[PDB]
């Protein structure tokens, strides 16, 4: 957490969110938790809400020690959209672009994230 490997790892994840996932066109509705004022039934239907701001807060708190836990929350954003909006909703297509560019960027950074993950895991000993 305070160690530089965790901080460097969190920094890379935050940059994927801000530079790539939040840059997806029309992605604003995913940037923050759903507003109940405009979507009144949302929290009755979706039991485990997730959004990009919540992911960034988790990164800031160093919640993620590897990409598997990060991806679990990223994929939950899409899972909720399929359930709430439907599999062919414009909003679900946006969520899929967000998820897709996240995976693509992780791949571009693989060798580097792999090293940080290994060292973070090593230090947990």
Residue numbers in the entry: 1520 to 1644
What do the authors of the reporting publication say about this deposited model?
Bromodomains (BRDs) are protein interaction modules that specifically recognize ε-N-lysine acetylation motifs, a key event in the reading process of epigenetic marks. The 61 BRDs in the human genome cluster into eight families based on structure/sequence similarity. Despite large sequence variations, all BRD modules share a conserved fold that comprises a left-handed bundle of four α helices (αZ, αA, αB, αC), linked by loop regions of variable length (ZA and BC loops), which line the Kac binding site and determine binding specificity. The four helices form a deep cavity that is extended by the two loop regions (ZA and BC loops), creating a largely hydrophobic Kac binding pocket.
Insertions x6 are present in the C-terminal BRDs of TAF1 and TAF1L and possibly PRKCBP1.
